[model samples]
Target: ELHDVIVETRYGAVRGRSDGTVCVWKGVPFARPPVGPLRFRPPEPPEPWSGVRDATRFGPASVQPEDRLISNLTGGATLPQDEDCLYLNIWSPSPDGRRPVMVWIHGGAYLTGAGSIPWYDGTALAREGDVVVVTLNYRLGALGFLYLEDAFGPEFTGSGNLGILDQIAALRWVRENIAAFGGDPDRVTIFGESAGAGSVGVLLAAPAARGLFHRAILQSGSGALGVRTAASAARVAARVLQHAGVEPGDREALRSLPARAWANAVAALGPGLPLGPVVDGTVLPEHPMAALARGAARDVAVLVGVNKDEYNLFALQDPAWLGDDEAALRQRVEAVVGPAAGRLIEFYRSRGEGSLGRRLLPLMSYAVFVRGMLATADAQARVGAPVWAYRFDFETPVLGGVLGACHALEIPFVFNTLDRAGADRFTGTAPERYAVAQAMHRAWIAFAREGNPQHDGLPEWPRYDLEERAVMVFAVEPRVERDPWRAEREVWAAAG
Candidate 1:
């Protein structure tokens, strides 16, 4: 059967295609594409169109290199890259009535990623949960976040935050148009992984983002801010101007460069990309964790957690790069945490044998990885939101039996698509794993439908309290514990 519907966005009426279960829409513009003189500026609303626009095929990804991490995770390539890449997609059960909405933001550490990856297909979630799901592409890399104020003028004040603005623009589009796509605009849940989780954390504190989302789910990464300082981001922009043989002081000359040249210059800067949400006076006033800790984002409900071994993927990429000697590991630790190595090791050991790395190499990796996640959890709980934290302990043997519930493993379970792809050892399409997926996906859907994430069959996920320091453990059987590693966390904090 054929299903197609038209929704009125801020731009105009756009036609969306639908399969039997979910009405799918693609390439709906939330922000005018950043190009030429408009580059580095906060998003601007697209002009209203006179005719119905088709949205069957995905649009171009932002002008970044192909997203390697997402492609690897999904085992597929994304749509072709392009400069005009500000678009969003929606999947809805029907367009005739209002339903709960869940907006997904894909992650690639602010350097890469698109919303159209295969694993993020919202059709199953829309069909099973009877809620609407929307995913969208935003500008990435230097094009989206390079601070070009000194080169471009005061008009580009928030250049370093343009990627974030792209997301806000998409949500603004949903607020205006989702009702026509059978979504309740007032009850939207924003969820993401890795850098996507970082984006959700930013929304938690953004003044412009307040009241836009009812709930948030952050998996595998949170409070992981990596943008350069405004001075640093501006320095990168100045270099971009100089490399193009234009005077940094001349705005008109810089703007005169062709879009292709601009894109090429931006791409060339990839190795030294000065992109990320900087601590600008506006857009992002402070670090998200610090803002949340100050009781700045208490209105939203939150679920945030990290994998048991988040840094394992990075370590696996080059195991021996950090030498076996204590001096080598100490240097590696110092590079990231400076003088915090001793406390970090003590904290990991405080967890006793289970938290200990099976081998010397794995022990070194585990010490660094788990310490960061536990610190993130502690920071998140300091906020007033109803927070739930977890550490996924489901082990997989195929990943050299050493990944040990590493990063991005929970994605398949939450999407209930373990049988679709990349679920082999990570999710293992077994009965128990499927049951876990059912419970997790149900909780996620419930959070999208209502502000709270509680479901009938799952164990009670208590809102985290600083005193109890509770964190739920998802393993062979779900269990709750008070402060999964209090002494360990204290060791690290004290050392810091």
Candidate 2:
């Protein structure tokens, strides 16, 4: 029996396709195309359309450099890229019944990645959890994050954070129109990995997005990373403009330049994607961690975690890092950690293991992903907020097990997309990977459905606290642990 999957949104009707168990609507506009005069501006309401809008096809990815990765994993490599890329996709068991909604924000260091990536297919997840799923595309690279407010006057106020504003616009869209697609708007859970998770952290603190989402799940991203002050962001912007030969003050040239110029210029700066949310003093007034400490997101339920070896994936990017010795390790740590370097380096040095790169991986992890996450978690826990902490401990056997549980490794497992193409290459062909996938997938679904992640499939996950610091470790044998990196936490805590 075929299901007629046409749902009416508040703005207009969208036609979808169904394969009996799940219905999907792809490429539905959440906001008007941010192009022409609307460039570098806050998103406006989607222009209402007359007839039924066809949503069977995915939309173009937001403009960025070609996302290079194994086939099927890089959604931007093949999909069309355009500035008019503010669209979303949905999956549901049926549009006639209410279900908890999950909105996903894809992560690429805020540079690349699309919700349309096959690795993010929501059909299996929606069907398995009996929930409504939504994923979206936002602006990326220089187009979304280059700081223009400082150089272009008040007219370009929030240009550095347009990507973040785009997310809020999408969430606002979900609140207004999700009920028709069988979603309980009140139970919306905003989740993302890496930069996407960092965006979630920003939303948690941003006053404009306060009540849009009820719960947040941050995988390998933290609020601490989103609190860049305007000065720092603008400095990076100045460097990018100079590197690209576009003077920031040249309004006519900046406005008329092609999108590739900005994307390519940002790309030339390297993988760090030297652009992101700026604390413009209005939309995002204070640091997200500081906001949470003062109880901004006191009522929101948060599930935050980091992979065991978050930096191992990045370390593989440059082969030369493999042969570095102790001297190099100390210098690298000193550069990234600054004043805290000597203390942190000495502390990790005593623990003693692996090559120079291997020994330095934890320090890099703390500098990049871990420490900020823990600080934010600690800030929230101090406010009596309901927080469940977790650690992805399942190391992949893909790269002779050297990569450990690297960044973005949890995506396929959480989405249960290990069966998807190219995931096998990334995840490696292991029968054991599927078990960890099942465990993580269930824990995430449980968290969104209810406020807690504890389920029958694994150990009893507890709320994070200063006293116990309970963390659900997702390994081959999932277990609850107390303060997995107590030393790392203490070193940073002591430094401050």
Candidate 3:
């Protein structure tokens, strides 16, 4: 069976394992290791191998902090991680070509997460939809996003966007080799949650990524986030260089440092550190949202959405928020939004009854997640692309329902992996929970196969436009509505 499972790739032949239903290939290298002279450089094609390579185990995750909070939610166990992590995994129903391909990019604030997480397993999705699923690892943090060209000369020109470039290279690999793994290169869909979704958004506007994927699904991510100007990225690079105790112009010294040292230095800079794609005039060129507004990647179909209470999870992490009264909440709101706090509080207060923290959850959700999704959807729709929007409204029964359809809560449902470990913590093992997963998983599958997301499990989902702002609300009983948050949206518009 191992010999029979051998499939040829552009670089070499790989022998994958089969799980009765799907042919699974793990740790297939997509690029040469970015070590030694290749450190901080754009991805280069992987070196060709002479013989069939065993591909049954996952490659190391990208260099990142060992203790990541979200790792608890996405399977608590840690896997080996290293700089040589430019590998991808595939799960296909069969090796027979012509099936739709769905490529997944894992998200961890561009710091953590690997294609190897159990929650992101592609087996069920592949078997259920009869599609080819791909998951990959890309450079992270300082190694992938540090912009040093301005300070270190032209040798590091594309460093700021190397992570995005890594993704592009992986997609190119899919286009070239997916046929042997049962995927149609022309029918590729890119989907992700959080930073991964943000990557999809950036790719939508990326000239380098154009035509690599036909459709995109962005779950709880906004193209509006993660972009930095060259100047901004340069400042971050300067800080990173200072923290690493390396001179800005010492390129050789910086490149020779251990990958762990680089990751630790950047991680010590804290979560607020600015690391991600830069709007350099060459590789990225412009902000993803700005580029999309100008009709970038206008031909690709897009499905964009956010959870109803997207920031609740983050808010819950702070114990102070749990004990906050109206006055404290008001004070917090004033601190964040200044003069607009009164009106914003009033607007959110009228919508429901709860603690000030609870009342403020929607405000934060809209500000962080919903607004960006709306902007991207509107921009894509205006450019004449089919853009469908959704709101994941299914609340979690965890921590007495505090999670509230929080960020990344919909991922398990979309993958139909609700039975996986830690999934029940976010999505309780209820029959209705499984029902929602079936609905979402099928919609995603249909969207990948065809450009539209309409399937028998869902009601007619309409394309989004500036006027109607049609949104599909996913819950125990999924339904469609025209402009779900008009009043709150207007509050934001007026405040702005």
Candidate 4:
């Protein structure tokens, strides 16, 4: 079932493969791997190949630290992490003309994550929906986000946002090459979850990312206020250089180190803890929330929402850390939000007056977690683009009453990949959920194809405005309600 073909690129014809149902192309570099002299610089256009190159298998992931790949939930033993990992994969039902294209960005808090994860397989979505699905691997952690421009001279001017640059490059590749894969160049929708959603949120404000995508879907993420600042970025750069055995003053020597060595030094620092995108003057002029508040996002249809108990997963993982004791919860809340502790507690308590302590704590946790997402949706409204917000209230039978509509629970439903690995963590191994998955996935694909996500049987999803606050509650019987949880929002709003 494996076949090969070559497609024309800006440099020359690049070879790809077709795995029967989904056309699978691997390794085709959008930008030369940012290694050696190219390290700490914006991605350079990949060199052209004179002859056909094998692209049947995925290229090694971007040279990442070993810890970055090891999920704490899955154990911390390091896996094979490489630097030559800036490659993209494409899945389509064979180019039949020009079909809508969906370019997905993976999320790992702007640090750890890869497109190679089995959960992200695009074959089902492409084959079932007859659309092109593209997933890509980008730079992560210190190697990707450490801002070293001023300290290291002009060689690493925008190194802080090299990861974002990688995404833009992948989109550019799709613009130039996807039409051959049965995808429309002009009708691209960029969607993602968690940090991936946050990236799309930033792209909404980035002038460089403008005109690159037609629609956006941000799930369980938002344009938050605390994007790193230049001063903060420079401090991290100093730390990175110090870790590499290069003094802060030795700019030339610091830039001279081998790319692998520097990447390893960053990796040694650990994963999921790397410094991320900053409000640099060039790529990002201000925080993403600020940009949206001032009406900076490109006027395009947007679908953004958060799960009901978004933070319960974190609490479940570390139950001892945030216990059921009210006094203990207050101490932890003060440590993070300081003066906002009392209001935060009251906000959740008000929502679940009759609920038990265990139930009430998680609901409060969900409110604190989903607040950013709701705020981002509000900011998007200021830009005058059509947006639909939702709260996934469905509780699963699994976890024995632990997690309720936590983060990433919606991924299986959105992509309809219910049987994929790790899906059992949320929904037990069952085909019955396929009906719900089919409904959600179809809506996402339909939204990507057109601006609206209207399908045949699903309830009508109304646009979110300042008032009305029309929100969809997804469950067995989906319902549309105005200003859902009005009391909780007011409590949280007044605290801020």
Q: How many residue pairs clash in each candidate?
A: 0, 0, 0, 4
Quote model 4's TM-score. Answer: 0.90
TM-score comparison, 1 vs 3, better candidate = 3
lDDT of 3: 0.86
| Model 2 deviation from the true structure expressed as Cα RMSD, one decimal place | 1.9
Predicted structure 3, TM vs. truth? 0.95
lDDT per residue (tens digit) for residues 1-496 in model 4: 7777666667666577777777766667788978766766787778887876766777776555443222543333343467666888888887657889998888777666778766777888888778898999888766678788767667677778888888888998899888877889999999988778877877877889888998998888765522578898887677677778887657567557765677666756643335778788888878887887787764877888877777666665456433455676667566556787776766555555333345455544434446666676787777788787877766655656466676677877887766676566566655556666777788888888878877875788888878888887777677777887676677667775
* Ranked candidates, highest lDDT first: 3, 2, 4, 1
Candidate 1, which segments miss by more than 4 Å at Cα? 67-74, 150-152, 235-247, 250-274, 321-323, 326-328, 346-383, 421-431
The whole-model lDDT of each prediction reads 0.72, 0.84, 0.86, 0.73
What tens digits encode model 1's per-residue C-alpha lDDT throughout 341-417? 66675544454343233333333433544543454555556656677776677765545556667667787778777
Which residue runs does candidate 3 get wrong by more than 4 Å? 1-4, 325-343
Give me candidate 1's TM-score against the actual structure. 0.88
**TM-score for each of the candidates:** 0.88, 0.96, 0.95, 0.90
Q: Model 4 Cα displacement at 212 (Å)?
A: 0.4
Candidate 4 residues lying further than 4 Å off, grouped into runs, are: 65-79, 251-274, 326-328, 349-369, 396-398
lDDT of 2 by residue, 178-268 (tens): 9988899999999999889999999999999989989999999987664568999888888788777887678777867788787888878
Per-residue error for 166 in candidate 2, Å, reads 0.2
The residue pairs found clashing in candidate 2 are none
At residue 208, candidate 1 shows an lDDT of 90
